[PDB]
Coordinates of N, CA and C and ligand atoms in Angstrom, one line a residue:
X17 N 73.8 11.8 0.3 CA 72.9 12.6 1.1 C 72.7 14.0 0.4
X18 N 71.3 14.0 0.1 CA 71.0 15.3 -0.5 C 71.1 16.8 0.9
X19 N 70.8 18.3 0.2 CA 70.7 18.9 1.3 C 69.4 19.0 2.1
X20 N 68.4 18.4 0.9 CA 66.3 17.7 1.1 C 66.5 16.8 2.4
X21 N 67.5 15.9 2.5 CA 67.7 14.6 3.1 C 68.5 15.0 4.5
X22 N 69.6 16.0 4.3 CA 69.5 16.5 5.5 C 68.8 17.2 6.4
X23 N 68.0 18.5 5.8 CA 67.4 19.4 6.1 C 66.3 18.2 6.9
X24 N 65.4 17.0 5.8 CA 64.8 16.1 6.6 C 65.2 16.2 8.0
X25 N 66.1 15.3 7.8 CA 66.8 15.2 9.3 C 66.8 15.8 10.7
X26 N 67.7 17.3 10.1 CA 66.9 18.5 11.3 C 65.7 18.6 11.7
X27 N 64.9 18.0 10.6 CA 63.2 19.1 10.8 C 63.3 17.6 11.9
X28 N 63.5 16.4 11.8 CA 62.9 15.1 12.4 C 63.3 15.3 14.1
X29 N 64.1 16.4 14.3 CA 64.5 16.7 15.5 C 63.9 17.0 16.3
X30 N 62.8 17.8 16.1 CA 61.5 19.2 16.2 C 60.4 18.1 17.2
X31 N 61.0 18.6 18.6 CA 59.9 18.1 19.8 C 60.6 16.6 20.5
X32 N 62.0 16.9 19.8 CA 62.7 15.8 20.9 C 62.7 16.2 22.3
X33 N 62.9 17.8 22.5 CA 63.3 18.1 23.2 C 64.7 17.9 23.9
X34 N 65.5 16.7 23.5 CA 66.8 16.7 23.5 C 67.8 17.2 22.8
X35 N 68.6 17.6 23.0 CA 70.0 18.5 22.6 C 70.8 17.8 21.8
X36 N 70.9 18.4 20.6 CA 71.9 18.0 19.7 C 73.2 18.1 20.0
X37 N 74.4 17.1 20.1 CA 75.5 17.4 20.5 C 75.7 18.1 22.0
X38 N 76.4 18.8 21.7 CA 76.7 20.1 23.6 C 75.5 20.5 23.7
X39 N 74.4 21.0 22.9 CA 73.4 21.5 23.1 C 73.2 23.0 22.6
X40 N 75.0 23.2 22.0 CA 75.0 25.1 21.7 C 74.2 25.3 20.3
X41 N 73.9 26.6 19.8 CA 73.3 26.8 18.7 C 74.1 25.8 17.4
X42 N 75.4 25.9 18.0 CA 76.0 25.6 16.7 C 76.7 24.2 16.2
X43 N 76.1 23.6 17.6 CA 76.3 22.0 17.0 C 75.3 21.7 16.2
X44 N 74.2 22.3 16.5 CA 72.8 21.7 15.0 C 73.3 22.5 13.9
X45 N 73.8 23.5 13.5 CA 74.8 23.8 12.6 C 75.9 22.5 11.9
X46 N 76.4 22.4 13.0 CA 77.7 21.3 12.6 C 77.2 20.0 12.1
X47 N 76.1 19.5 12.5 CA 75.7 18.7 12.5 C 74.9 18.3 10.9
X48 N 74.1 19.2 10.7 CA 73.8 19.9 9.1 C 74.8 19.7 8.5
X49 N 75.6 20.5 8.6 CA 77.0 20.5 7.7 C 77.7 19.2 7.5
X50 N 78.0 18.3 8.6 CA 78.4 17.3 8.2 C 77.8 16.1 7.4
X51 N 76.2 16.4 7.8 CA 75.6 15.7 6.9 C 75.6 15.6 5.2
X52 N 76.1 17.3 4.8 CA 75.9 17.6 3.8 C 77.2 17.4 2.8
X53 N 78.6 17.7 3.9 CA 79.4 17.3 3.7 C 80.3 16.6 4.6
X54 N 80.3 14.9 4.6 CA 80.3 14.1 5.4 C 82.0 14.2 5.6
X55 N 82.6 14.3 4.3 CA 84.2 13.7 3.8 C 84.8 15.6 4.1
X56 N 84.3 16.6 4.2 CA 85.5 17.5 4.2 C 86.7 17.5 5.8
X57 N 87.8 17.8 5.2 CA 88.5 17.9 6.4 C 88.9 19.5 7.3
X58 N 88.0 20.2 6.6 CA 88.4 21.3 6.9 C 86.9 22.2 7.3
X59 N 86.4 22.3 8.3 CA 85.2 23.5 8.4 C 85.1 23.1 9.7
X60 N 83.4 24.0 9.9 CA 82.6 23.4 11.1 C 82.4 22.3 11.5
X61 N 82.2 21.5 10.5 CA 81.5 20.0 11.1 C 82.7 19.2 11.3
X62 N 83.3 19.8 10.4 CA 85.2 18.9 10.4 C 86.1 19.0 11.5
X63 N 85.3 20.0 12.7 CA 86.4 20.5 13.2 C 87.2 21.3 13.4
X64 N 87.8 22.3 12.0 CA 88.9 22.9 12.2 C 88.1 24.0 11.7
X65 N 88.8 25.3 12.2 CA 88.7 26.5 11.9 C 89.8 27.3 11.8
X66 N 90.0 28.8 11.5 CA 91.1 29.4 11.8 C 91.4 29.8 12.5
X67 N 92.3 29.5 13.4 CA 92.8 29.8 14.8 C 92.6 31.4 15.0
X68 N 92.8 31.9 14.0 CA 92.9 33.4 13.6 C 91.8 34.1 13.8
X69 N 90.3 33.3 13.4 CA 89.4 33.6 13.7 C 88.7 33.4 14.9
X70 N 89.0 33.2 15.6 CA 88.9 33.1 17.0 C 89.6 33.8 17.8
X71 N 89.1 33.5 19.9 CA 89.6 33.7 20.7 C 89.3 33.1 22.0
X72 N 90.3 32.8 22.6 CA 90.2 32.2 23.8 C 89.9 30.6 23.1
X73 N 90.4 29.7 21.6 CA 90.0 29.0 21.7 C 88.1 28.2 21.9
X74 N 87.6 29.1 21.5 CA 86.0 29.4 21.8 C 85.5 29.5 20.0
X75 N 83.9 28.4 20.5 CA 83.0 28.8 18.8 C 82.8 30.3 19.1
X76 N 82.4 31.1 18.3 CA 81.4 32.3 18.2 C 80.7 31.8 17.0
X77 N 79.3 32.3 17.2 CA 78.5 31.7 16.5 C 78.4 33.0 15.4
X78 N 78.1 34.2 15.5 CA 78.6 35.5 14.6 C 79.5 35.3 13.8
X79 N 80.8 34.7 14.1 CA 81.8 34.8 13.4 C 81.9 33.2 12.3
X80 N 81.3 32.6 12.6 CA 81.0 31.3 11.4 C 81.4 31.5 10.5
X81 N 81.0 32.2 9.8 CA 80.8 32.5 8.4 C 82.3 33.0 8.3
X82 N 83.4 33.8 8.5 CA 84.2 33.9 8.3 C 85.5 33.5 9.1
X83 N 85.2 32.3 10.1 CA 86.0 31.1 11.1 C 86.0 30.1 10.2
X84 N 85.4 30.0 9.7 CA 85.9 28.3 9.0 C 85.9 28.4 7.0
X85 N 86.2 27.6 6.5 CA 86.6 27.9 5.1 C 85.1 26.9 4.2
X86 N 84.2 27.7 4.3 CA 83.4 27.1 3.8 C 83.5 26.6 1.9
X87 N 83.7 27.5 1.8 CA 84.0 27.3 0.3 C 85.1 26.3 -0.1
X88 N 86.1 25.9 0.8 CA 86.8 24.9 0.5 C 86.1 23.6 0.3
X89 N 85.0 23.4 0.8 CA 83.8 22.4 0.7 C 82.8 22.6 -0.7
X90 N 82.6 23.7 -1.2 CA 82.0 24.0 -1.9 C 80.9 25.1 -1.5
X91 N 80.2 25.4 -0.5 CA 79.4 26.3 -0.1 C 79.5 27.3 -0.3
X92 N 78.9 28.3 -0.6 CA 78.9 29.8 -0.6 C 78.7 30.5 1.0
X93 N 79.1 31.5 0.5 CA 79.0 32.5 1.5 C 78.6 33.8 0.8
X94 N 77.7 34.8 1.4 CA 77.0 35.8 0.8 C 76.6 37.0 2.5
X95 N 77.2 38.2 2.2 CA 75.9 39.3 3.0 C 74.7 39.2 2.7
X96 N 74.4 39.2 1.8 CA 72.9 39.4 0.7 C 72.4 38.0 1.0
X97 N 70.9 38.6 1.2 CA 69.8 37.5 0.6 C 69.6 37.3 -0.8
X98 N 68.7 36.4 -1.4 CA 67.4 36.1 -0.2 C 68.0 35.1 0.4
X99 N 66.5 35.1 1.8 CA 66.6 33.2 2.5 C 66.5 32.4 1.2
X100 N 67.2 31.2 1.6 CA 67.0 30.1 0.8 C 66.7 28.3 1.9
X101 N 65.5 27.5 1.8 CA 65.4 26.5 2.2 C 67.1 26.0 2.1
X102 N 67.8 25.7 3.1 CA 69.0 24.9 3.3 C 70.1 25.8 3.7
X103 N 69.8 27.0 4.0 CA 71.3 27.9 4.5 C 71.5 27.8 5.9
X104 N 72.4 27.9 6.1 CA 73.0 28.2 7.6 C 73.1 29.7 7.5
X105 N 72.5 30.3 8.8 CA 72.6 31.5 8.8 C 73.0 32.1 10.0
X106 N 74.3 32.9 9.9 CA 74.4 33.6 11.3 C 73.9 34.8 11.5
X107 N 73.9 34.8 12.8 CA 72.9 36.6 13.8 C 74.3 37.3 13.9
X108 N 74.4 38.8 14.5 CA 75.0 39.5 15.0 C 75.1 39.2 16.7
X109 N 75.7 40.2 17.4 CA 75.7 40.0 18.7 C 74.6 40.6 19.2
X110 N 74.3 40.4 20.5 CA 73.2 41.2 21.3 C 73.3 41.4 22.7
X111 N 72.6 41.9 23.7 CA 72.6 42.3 24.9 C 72.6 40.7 25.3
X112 N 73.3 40.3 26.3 CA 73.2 38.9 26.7 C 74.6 37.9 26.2
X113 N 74.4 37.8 25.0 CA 75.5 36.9 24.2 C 76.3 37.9 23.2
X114 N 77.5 37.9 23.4 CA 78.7 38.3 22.6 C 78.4 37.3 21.6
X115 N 78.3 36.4 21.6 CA 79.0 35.2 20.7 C 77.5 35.3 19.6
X116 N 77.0 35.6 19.6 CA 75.9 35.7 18.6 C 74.8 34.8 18.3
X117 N 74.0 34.0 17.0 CA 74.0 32.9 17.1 C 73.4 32.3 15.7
X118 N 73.2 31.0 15.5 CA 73.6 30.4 14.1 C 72.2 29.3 13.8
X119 N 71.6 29.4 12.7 CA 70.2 28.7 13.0 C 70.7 28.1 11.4
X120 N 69.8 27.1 11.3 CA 69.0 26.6 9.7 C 68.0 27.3 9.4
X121 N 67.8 27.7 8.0 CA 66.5 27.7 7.1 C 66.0 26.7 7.0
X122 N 64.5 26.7 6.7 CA 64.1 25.6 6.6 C 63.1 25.7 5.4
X123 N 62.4 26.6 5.4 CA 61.6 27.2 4.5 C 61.3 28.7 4.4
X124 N 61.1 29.0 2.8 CA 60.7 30.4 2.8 C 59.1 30.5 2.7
X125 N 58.1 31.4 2.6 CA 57.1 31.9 2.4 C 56.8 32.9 2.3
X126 N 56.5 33.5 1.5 CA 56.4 35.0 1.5 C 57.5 35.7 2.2
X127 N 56.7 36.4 3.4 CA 57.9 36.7 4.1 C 58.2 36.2 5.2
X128 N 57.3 34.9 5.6 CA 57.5 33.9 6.3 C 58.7 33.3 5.9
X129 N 59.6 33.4 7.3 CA 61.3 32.3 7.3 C 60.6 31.5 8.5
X130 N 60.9 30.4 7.8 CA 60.9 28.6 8.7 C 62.3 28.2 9.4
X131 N 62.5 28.6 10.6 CA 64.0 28.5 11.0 C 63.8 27.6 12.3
X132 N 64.9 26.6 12.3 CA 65.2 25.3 13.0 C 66.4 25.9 13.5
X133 N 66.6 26.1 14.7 CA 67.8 26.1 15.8 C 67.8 25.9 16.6
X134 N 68.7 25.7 18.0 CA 68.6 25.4 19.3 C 69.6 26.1 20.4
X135 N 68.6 26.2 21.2 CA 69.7 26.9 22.1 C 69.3 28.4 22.0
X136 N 68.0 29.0 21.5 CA 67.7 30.6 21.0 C 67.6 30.8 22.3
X137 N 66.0 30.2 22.9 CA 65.7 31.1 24.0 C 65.9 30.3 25.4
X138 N 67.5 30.0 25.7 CA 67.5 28.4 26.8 C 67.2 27.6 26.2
X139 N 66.3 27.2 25.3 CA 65.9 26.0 25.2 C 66.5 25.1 24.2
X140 N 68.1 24.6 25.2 CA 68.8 23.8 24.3 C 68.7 22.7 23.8
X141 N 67.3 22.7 23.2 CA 67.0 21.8 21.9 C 66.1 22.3 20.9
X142 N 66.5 21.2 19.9 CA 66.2 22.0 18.3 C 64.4 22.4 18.3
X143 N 64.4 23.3 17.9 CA 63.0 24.1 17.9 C 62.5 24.8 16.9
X144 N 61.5 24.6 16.2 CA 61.1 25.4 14.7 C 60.6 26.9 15.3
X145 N 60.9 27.6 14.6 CA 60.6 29.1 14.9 C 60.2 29.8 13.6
X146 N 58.8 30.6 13.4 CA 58.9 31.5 12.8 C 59.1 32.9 12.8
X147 N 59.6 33.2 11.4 CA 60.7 34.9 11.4 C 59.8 35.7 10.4
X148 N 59.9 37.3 10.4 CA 59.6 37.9 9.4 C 60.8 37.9 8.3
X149 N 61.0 37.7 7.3 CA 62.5 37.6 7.0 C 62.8 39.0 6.9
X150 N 61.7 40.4 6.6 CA 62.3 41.5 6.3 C 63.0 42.4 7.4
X151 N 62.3 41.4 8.8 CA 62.6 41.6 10.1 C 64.0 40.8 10.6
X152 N 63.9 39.9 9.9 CA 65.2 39.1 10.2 C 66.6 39.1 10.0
X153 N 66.6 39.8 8.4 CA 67.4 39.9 7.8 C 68.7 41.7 8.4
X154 N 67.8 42.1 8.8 CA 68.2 43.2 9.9 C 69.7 42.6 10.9
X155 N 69.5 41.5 11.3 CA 70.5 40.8 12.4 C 71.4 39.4 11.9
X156 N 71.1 39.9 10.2 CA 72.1 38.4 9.9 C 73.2 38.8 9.7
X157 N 74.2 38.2 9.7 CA 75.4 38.2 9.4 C 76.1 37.6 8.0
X158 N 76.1 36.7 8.0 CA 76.3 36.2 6.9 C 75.4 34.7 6.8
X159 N 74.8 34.7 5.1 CA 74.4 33.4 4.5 C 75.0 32.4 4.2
X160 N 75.2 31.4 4.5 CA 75.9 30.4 4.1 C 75.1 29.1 3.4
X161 N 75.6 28.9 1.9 CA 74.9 28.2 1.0 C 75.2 27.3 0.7
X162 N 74.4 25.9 0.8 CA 75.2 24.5 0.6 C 75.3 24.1 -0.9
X163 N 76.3 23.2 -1.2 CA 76.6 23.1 -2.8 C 75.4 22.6 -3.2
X164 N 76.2 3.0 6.1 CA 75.6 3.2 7.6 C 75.9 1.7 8.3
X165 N 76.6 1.4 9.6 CA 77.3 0.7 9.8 C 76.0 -0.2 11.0
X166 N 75.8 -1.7 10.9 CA 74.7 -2.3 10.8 C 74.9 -3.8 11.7
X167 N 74.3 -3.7 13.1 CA 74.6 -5.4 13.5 C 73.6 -6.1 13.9
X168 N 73.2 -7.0 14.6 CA 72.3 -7.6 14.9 C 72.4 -7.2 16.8
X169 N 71.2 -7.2 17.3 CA 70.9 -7.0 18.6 C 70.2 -7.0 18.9
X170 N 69.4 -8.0 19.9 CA 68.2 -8.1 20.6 C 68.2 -6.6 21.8
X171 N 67.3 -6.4 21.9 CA 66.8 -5.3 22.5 C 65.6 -5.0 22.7
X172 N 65.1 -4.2 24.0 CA 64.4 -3.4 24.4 C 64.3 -2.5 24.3
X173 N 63.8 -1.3 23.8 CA 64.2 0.4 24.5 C 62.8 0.8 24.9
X174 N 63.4 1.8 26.1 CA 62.4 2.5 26.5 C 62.2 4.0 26.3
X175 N 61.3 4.1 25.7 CA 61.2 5.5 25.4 C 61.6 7.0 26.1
X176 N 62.1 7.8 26.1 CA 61.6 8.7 27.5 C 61.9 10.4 26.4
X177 N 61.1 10.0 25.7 CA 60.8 11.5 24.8 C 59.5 11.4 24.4
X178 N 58.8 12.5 24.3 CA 57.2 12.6 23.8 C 56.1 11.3 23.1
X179 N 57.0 11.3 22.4 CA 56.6 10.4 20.8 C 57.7 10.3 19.6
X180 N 58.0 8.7 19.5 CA 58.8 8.7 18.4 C 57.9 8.2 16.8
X181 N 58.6 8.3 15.8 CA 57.8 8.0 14.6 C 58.3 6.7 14.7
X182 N 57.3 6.0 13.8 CA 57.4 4.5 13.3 C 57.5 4.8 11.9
X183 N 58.5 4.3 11.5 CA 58.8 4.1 9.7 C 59.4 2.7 9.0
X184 N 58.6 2.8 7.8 CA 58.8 1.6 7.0 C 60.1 1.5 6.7
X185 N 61.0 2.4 6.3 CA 62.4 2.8 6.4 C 63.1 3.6 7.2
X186 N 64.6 3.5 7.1 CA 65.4 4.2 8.3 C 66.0 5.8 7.6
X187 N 65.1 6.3 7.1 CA 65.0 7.9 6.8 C 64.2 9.0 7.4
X188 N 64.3 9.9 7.4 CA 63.3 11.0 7.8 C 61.7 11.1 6.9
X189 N 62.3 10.9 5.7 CA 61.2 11.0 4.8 C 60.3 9.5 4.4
X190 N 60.7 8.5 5.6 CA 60.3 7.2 5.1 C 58.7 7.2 5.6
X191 N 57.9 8.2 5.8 CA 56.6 8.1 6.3 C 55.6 7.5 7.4
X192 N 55.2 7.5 8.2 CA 54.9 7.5 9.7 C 54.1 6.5 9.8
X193 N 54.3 5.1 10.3 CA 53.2 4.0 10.4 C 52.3 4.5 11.7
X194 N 53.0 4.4 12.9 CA 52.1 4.8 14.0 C 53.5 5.4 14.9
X195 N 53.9 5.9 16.2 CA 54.3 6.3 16.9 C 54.5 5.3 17.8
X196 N 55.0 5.6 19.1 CA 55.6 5.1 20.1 C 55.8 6.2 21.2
X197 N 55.1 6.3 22.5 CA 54.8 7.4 23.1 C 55.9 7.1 24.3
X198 N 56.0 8.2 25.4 CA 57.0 8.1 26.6 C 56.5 7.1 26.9
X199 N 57.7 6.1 27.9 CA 57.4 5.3 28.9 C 57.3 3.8 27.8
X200 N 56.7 3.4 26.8 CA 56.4 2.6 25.9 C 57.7 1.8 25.6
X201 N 57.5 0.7 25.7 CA 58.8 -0.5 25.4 C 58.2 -1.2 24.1
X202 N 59.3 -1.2 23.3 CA 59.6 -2.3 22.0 C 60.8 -3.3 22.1
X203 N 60.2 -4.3 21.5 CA 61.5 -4.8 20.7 C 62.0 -4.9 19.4
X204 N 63.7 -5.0 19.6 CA 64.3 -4.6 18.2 C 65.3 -5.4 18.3
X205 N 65.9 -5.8 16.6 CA 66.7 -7.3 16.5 C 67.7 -6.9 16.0
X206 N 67.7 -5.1 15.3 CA 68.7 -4.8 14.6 C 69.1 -3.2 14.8
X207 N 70.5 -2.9 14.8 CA 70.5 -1.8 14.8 C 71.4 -1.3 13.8
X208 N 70.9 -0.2 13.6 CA 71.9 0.8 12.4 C 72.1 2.0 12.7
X209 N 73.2 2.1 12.6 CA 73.8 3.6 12.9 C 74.8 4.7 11.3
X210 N 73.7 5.4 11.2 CA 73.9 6.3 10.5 C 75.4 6.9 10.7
X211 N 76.4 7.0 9.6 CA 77.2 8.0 10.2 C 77.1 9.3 10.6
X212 N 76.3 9.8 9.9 CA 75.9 11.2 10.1 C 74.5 11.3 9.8
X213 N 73.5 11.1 10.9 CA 72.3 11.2 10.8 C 71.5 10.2 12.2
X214 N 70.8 9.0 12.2 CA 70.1 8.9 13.3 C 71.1 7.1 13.5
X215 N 70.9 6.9 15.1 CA 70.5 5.4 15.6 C 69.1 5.2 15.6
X216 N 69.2 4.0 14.5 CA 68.0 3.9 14.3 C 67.8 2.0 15.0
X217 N 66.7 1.8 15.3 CA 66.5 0.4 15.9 C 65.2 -0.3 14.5
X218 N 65.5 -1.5 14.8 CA 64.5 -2.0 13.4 C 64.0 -3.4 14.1
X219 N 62.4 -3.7 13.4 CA 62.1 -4.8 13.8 C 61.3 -5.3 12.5
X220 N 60.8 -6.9 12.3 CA 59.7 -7.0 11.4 C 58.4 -6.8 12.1
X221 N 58.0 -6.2 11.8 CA 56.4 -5.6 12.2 C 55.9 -6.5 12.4
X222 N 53.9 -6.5 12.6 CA 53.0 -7.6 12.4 C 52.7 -7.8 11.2
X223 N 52.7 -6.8 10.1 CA 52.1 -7.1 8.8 C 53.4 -7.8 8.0
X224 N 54.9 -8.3 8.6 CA 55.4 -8.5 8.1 C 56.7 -7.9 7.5
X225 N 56.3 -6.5 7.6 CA 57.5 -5.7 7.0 C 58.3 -5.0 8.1
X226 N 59.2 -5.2 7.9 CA 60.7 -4.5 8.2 C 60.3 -2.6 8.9
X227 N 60.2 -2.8 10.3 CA 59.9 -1.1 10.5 C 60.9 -0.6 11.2
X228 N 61.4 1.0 11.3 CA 62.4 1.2 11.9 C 62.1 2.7 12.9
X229 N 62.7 2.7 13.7 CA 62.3 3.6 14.7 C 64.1 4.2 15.1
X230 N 63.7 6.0 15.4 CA 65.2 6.8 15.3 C 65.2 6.9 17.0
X231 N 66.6 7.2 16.9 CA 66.7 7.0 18.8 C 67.4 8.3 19.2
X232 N 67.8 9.1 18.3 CA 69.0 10.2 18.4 C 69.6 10.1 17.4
X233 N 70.6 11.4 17.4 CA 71.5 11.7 16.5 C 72.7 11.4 16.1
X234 N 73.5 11.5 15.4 CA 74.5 10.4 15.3 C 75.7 11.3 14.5
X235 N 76.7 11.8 14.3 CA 78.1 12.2 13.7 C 79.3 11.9 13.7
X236 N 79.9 11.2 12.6 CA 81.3 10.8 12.7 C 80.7 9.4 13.3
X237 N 79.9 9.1 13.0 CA 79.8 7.6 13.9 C 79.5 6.7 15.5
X238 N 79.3 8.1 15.7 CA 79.1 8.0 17.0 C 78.0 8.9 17.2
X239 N 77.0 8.7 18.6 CA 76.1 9.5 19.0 C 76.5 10.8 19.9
X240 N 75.4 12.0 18.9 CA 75.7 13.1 19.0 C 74.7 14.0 19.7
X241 N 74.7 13.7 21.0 CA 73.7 14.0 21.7 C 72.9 12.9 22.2
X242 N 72.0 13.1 23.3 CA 71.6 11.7 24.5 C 70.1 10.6 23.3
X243 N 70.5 10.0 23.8 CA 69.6 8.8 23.1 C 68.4 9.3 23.5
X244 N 67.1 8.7 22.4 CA 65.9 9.3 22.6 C 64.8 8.2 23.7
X245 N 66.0 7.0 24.3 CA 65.2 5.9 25.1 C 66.3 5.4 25.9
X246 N 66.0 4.5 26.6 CA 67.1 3.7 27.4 C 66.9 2.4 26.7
X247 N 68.0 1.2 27.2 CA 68.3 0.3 26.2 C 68.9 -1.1 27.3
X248 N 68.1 -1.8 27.2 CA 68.8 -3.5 27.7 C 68.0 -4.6 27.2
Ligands
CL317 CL1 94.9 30.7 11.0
CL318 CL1 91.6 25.9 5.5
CL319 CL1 78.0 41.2 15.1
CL320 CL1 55.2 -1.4 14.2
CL321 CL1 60.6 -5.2 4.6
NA322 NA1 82.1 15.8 1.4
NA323 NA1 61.4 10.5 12.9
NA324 NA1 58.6 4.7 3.0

């Protein structure tokens, strides 16, 4: 998994409306990270941090960047810009939250920043936001720079999110045949679950080919946050 293939991933989140993990800013952080680095045993997505860096047993999303050992993974860590498409970046504190809070890049533009987080304004699910970066960079804290198990199952699901994509493959970037709106029932013969990335459900289409549809998120092998349908 590239960091193109994860970042995919997050952006595929954008209008689930459902909550990654707990729903805090910094499980879609963790969740990123594990993608990117599936095998470390030591960080955010891994789990561990320095007890040292902490209190009360609690994430702080400010203190990221210097709670867990990123660079034992290979990532960088930097004060300094620039944004770069694929960083994790944490905020300072503010009136409201002590704990701060922790988003993705997603893209740069000028001085357009493309940032994917959850949990900014209440709205604990993942949500694209644009930033000024020269406005942004005011409240960062530190940059952080990055370096499927398969059975057979008859099934139904029922949708109960907006619209899901239909894809020829079980990636983000496998390109959109048609959709699948709330309320809408399929059937599916096979399922695959991503270790770190989506439950995805698959059927052979009408034209014959093999199409696959994402249902949620998935980490360590298990789902990471509520399914994007119901299932019998
Ligand atoms: Cl420690
Ligand atoms: Cl360590
Ligand atoms: Cl701070
Ligand atoms: Cl189809
Ligand atoms: Cl096929
Ligand atoms: Na790894
Ligand atoms: Na998708
Ligand atoms: Na494709």
């Amino acid at each position: 998994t590239t960091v193109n293939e994860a970042l995919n991933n997050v952006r595929a989140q954008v209008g689930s409306g459902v909550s990654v993990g707990n729903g805090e800013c910094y499980a879609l952080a963790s969740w990123y990270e594990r993608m990117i680095s599936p095998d470390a045993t030591v960080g955010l997505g891994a789990g561990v941090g320095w007890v040292s860096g902490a209190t009360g047993d609690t994430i702080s999303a400010k203190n990221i960047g210097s709670s867990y050992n990123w660079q034992a993974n290979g990532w960088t860590v930097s004060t300094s810009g620039p944004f770069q498409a694929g960083q994790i970046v944490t905020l300072g504190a503010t009136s409201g939250n002590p704990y701060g809070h922790v988003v993705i890049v997603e893209a740069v533009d000028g001085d357009r920043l493309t940032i994917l987080e959850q949990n900014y304004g209440g709205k604990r699910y993942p949500t694209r936001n644009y930033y000024s970066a020269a406005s942004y960079r005011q409240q960062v804290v530190h940059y952080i720079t990055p370096p499927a198990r398969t059975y057979r199952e008859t099934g139904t699901m029922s949708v109960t999110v907006d619209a899901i994509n239909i894809r020829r493959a079980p990636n983000t970037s496998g390109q959109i045949v048609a959709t699948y709106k709330r309320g809408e029932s399929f059937d599916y013969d096979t399922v695959i679950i991503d270790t770190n990335g989506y439950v995805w459900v698959s059927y052979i289409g009408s034209s014959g080919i093999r199409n696959y549809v994402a249902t949620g998120a998935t980490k360590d092998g298990k789902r990471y946050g509520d399914a994007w349908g119901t299932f019998k």
